[PDB]
Short mmCIF file of C-alpha atoms in Angstrom, two decimals:
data_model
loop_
_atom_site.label_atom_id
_atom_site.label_comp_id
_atom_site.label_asym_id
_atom_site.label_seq_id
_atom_site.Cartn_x
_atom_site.Cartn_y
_atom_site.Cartn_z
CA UNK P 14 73.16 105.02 124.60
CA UNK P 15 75.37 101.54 125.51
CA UNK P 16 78.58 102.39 123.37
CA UNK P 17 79.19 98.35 122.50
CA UNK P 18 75.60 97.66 120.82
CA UNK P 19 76.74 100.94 118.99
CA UNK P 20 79.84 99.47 118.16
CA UNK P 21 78.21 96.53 117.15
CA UNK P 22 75.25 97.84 114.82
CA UNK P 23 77.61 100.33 113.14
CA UNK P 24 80.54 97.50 112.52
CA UNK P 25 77.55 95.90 109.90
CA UNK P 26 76.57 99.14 107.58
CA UNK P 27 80.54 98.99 106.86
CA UNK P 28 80.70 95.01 105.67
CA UNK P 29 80.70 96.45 102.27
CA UNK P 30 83.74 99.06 102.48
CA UNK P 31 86.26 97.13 104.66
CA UNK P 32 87.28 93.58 106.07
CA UNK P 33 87.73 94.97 109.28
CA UNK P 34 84.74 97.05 110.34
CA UNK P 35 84.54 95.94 113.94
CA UNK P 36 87.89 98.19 114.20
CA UNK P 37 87.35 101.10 111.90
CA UNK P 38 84.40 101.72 113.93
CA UNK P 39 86.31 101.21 117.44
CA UNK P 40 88.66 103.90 115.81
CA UNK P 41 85.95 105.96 114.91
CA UNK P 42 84.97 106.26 118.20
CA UNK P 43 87.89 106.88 119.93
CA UNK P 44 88.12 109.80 117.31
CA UNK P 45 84.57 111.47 118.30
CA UNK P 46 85.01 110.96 121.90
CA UNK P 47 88.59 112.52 122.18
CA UNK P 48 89.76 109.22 124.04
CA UNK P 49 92.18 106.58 122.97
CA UNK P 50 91.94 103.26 121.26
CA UNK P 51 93.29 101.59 123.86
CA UNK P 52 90.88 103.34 126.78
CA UNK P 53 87.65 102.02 125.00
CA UNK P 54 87.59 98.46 127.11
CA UNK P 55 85.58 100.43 129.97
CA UNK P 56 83.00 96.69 129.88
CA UNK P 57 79.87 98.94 130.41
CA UNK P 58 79.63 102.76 129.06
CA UNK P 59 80.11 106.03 127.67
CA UNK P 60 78.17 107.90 125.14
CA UNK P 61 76.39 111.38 124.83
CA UNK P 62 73.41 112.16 122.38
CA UNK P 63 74.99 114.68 120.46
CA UNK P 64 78.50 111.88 120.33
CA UNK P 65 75.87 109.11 119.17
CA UNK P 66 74.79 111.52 115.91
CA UNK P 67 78.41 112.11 115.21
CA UNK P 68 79.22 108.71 114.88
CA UNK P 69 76.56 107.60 113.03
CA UNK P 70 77.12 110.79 110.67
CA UNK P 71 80.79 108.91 110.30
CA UNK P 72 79.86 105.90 109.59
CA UNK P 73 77.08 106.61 107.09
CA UNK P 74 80.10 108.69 105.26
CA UNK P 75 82.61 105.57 105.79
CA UNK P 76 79.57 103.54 104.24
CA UNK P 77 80.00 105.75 101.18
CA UNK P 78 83.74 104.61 100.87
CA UNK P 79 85.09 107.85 102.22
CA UNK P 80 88.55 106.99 103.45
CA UNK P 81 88.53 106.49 106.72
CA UNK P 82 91.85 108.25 107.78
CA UNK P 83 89.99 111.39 106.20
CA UNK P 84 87.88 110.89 108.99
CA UNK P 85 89.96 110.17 111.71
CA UNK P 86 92.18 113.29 110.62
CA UNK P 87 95.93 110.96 110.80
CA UNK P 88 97.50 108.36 108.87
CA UNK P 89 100.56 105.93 110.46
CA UNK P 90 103.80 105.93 108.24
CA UNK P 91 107.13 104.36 109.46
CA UNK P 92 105.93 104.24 112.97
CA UNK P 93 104.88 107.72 113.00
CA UNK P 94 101.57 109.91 112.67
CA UNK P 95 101.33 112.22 109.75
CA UNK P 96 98.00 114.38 109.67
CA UNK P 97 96.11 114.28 106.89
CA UNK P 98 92.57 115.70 105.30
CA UNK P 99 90.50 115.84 102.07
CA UNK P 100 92.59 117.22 99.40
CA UNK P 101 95.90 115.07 100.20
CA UNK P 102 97.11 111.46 99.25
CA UNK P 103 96.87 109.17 102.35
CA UNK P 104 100.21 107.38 103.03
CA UNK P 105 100.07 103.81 101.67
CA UNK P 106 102.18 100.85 103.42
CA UNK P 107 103.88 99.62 100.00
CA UNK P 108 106.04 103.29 100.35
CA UNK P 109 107.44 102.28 104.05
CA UNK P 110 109.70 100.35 101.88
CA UNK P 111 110.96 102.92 99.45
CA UNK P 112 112.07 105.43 102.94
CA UNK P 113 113.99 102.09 104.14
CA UNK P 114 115.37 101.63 101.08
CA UNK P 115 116.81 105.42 100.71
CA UNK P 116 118.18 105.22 104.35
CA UNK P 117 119.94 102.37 103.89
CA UNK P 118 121.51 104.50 100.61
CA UNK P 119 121.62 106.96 103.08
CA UNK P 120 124.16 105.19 105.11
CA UNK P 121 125.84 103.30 102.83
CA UNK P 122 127.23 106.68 100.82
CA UNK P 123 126.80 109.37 103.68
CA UNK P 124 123.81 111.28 101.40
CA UNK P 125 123.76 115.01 102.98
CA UNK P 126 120.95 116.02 100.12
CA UNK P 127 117.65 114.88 99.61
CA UNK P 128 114.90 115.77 97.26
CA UNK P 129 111.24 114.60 97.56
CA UNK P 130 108.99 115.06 94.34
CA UNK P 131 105.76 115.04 94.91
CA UNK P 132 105.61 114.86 98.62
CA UNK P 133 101.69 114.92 99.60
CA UNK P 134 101.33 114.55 103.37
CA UNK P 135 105.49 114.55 103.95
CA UNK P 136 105.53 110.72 103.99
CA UNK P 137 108.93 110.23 102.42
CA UNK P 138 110.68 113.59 102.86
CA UNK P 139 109.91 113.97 106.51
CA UNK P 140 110.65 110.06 107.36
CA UNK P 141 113.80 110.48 105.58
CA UNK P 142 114.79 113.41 107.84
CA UNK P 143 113.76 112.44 110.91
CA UNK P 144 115.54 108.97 110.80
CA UNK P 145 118.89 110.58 109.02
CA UNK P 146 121.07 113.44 109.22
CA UNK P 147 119.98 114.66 105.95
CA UNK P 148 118.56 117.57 104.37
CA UNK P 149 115.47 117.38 102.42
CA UNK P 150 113.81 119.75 99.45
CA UNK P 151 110.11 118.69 99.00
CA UNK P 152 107.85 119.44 96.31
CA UNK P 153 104.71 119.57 95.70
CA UNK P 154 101.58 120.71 92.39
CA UNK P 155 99.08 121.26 95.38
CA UNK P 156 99.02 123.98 97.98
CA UNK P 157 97.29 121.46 100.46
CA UNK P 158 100.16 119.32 99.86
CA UNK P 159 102.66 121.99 101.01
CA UNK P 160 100.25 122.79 103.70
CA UNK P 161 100.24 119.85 104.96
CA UNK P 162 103.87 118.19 104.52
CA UNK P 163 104.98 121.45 106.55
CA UNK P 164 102.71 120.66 109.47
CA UNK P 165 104.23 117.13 109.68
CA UNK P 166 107.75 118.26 109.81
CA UNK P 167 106.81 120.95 112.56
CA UNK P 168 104.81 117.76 114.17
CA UNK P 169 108.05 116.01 113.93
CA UNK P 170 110.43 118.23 114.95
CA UNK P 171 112.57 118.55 111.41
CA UNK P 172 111.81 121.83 110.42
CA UNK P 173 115.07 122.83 110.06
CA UNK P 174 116.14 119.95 107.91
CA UNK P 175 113.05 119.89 105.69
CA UNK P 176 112.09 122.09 103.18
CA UNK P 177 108.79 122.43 101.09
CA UNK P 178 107.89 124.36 98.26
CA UNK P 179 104.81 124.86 95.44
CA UNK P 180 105.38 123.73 92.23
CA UNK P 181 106.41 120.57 89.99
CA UNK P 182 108.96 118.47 89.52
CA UNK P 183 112.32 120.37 90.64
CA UNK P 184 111.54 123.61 89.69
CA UNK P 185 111.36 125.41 92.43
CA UNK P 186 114.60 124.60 93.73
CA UNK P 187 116.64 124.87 90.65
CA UNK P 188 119.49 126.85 92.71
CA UNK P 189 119.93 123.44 94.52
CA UNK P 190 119.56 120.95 91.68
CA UNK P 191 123.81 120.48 91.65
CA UNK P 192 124.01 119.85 95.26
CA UNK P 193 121.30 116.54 95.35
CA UNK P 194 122.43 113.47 95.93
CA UNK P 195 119.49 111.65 95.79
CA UNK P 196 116.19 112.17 94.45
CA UNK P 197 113.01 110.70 96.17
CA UNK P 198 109.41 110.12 94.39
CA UNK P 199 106.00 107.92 95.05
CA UNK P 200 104.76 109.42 91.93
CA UNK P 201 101.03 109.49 90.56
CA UNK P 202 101.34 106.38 88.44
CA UNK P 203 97.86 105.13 87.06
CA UNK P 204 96.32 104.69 83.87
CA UNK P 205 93.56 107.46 83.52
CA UNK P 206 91.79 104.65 81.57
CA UNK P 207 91.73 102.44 85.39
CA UNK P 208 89.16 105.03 86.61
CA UNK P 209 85.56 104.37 85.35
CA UNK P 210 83.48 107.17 85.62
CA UNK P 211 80.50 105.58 87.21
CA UNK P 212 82.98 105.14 90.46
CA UNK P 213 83.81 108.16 93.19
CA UNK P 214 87.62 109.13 93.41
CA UNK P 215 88.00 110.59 96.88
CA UNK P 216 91.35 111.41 96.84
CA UNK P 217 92.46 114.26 94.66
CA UNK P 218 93.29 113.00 91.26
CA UNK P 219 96.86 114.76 90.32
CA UNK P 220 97.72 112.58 93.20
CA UNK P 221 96.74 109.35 91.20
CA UNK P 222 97.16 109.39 87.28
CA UNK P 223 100.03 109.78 85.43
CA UNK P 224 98.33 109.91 81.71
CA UNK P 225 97.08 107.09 79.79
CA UNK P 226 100.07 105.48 80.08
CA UNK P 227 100.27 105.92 83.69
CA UNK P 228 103.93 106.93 82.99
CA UNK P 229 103.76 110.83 82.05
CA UNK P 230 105.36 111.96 85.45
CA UNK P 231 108.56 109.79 84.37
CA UNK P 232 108.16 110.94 80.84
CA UNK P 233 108.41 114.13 81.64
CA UNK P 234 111.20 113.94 84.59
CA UNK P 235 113.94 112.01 82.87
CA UNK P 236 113.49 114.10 79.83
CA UNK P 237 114.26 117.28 81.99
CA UNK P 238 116.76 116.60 84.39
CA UNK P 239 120.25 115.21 83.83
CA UNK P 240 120.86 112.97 86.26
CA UNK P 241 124.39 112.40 86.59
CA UNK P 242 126.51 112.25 89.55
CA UNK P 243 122.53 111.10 91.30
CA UNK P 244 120.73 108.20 92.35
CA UNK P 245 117.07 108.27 91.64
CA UNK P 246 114.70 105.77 93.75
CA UNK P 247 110.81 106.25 92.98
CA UNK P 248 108.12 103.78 93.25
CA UNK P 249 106.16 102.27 90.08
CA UNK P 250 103.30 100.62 88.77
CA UNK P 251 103.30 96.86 88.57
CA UNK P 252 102.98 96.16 85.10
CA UNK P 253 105.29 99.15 83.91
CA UNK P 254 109.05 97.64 83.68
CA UNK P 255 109.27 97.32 80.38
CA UNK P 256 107.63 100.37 79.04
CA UNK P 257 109.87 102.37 81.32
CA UNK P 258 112.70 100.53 80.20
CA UNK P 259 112.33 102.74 77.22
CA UNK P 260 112.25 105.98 78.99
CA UNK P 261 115.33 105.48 81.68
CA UNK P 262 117.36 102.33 80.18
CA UNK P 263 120.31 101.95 82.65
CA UNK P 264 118.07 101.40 85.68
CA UNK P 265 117.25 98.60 87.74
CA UNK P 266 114.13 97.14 89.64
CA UNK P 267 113.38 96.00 92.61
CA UNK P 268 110.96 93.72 94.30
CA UNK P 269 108.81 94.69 97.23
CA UNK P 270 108.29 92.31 99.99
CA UNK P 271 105.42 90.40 98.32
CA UNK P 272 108.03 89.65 95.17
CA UNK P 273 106.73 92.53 92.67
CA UNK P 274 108.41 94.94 90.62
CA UNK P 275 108.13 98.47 92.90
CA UNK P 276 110.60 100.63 92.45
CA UNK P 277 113.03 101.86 89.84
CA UNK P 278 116.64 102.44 90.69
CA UNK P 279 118.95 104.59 88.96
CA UNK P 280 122.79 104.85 91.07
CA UNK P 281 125.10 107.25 88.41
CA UNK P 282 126.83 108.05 91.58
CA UNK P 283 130.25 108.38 91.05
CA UNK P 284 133.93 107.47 92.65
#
């Protein structure tokens, strides 16, 4: 009934899934009572039966290794809060830096066209739009995906400027192919061979493995599109320079903020 031993009892069962389970379960909270993270420092109170079964439902699920921003229905990307849900890739951090990458390409050439392969929640796409004047085509394999990516636009107000539809690659908006500029990707990039099948995959798994390479998505992209007059930026696997050295030569790669190899970089641009 006291919310804080609550807090405190449920921040243990999740030692096991998290370093920080004091906060996941403040969070947690804050999602089943409707209140906000920041409103949660009343010193004494303020939980209801049916609110204490919820929680503990939660955090038994967390416990399991669920992702939490399943749970808490939201994910933060570039400062702002894409929904998410079971069925779509949560927004990692390492990406942030691939959307301030492209805007700075953005600016620096005065891009009008934009496409996003593989968009998932809208991470890149709808960043890219709402910090730019650009236009952006989105795809994605999953209907969640396109669900999804077109409630976060809506959410953030670039509807007009932002434009999903089903299917892979480009090839649903091969009418538009000559007018891109640029073209976008955080593309499923492991090893099928990284998954053991004792372990649970939560998050849906054309979202995650690109063959047993790990590299079939680039495979298959730079032997179908002709690039020219385009700069490509999509994020990579750590250990997969070389081998996609032999796929793309030409590019270049680029080191994230903790000094790995990130992100492949193809500029055939012209003057």
């Amino acid at each position: 009934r006291k919310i804080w031993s609550l807090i405190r009892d449920c921040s243990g069962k999740l030692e096991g899934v998290t370093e920080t389970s004091v906060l996941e379960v403040l969070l947690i909270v804050s999602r089943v009572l409707g209140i906000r993270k920041e409103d949660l420092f009343l010193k004494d109170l303020g939980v209801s039966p049916t609110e204490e079964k919820r929680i503990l439902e939660l955090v038994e699920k967390r416990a399991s290794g669920y992702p939490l921003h399943y749970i808490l229905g939201e994910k933060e990307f570039m400062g702002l809060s894409f929904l998410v849900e079971e069925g779509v890739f949560v927004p990692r951090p390492e990406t942030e830096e691939l959307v301030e990458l492209a805007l700075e390409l953005i600016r620096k050439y005065g891009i009008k066209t934009v496409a996003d392969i593989g968009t998932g929640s809208g991470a890149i796409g709808v960043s890219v739009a709402k910090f730019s004047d650009a236009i952006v085509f989105a795809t994605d394999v999953s209907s969640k995906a396109v669900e999804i990516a077109r409630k976060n636009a809506e959410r953030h107000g670039v509807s007009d400027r932002f434009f999903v539809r089903k299917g892979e690659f480009l090839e649903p908006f091969k009418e538009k192919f000559a007018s891109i500029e640029m073209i976008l990707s955080n593309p499923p990039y492991v090893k099928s061979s990284a998954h053991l099948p004792k372990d649970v995959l939560f998050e849906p798994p054309e979202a995650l493995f690109g063959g047993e390479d790990g590299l079939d998505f680039y495979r298959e992209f730079f032997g179908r599109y002709d690039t020219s007059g385009k700069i490509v930026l999509m994020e990579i696997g750590e250990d997969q320079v070389e081998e996609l050295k032999k796929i793309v030569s030409d590019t270049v790669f680029l080191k994230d903020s903790a000094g790995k190899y990130r992100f492949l970089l193809l500029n055939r641009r012209s003057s």
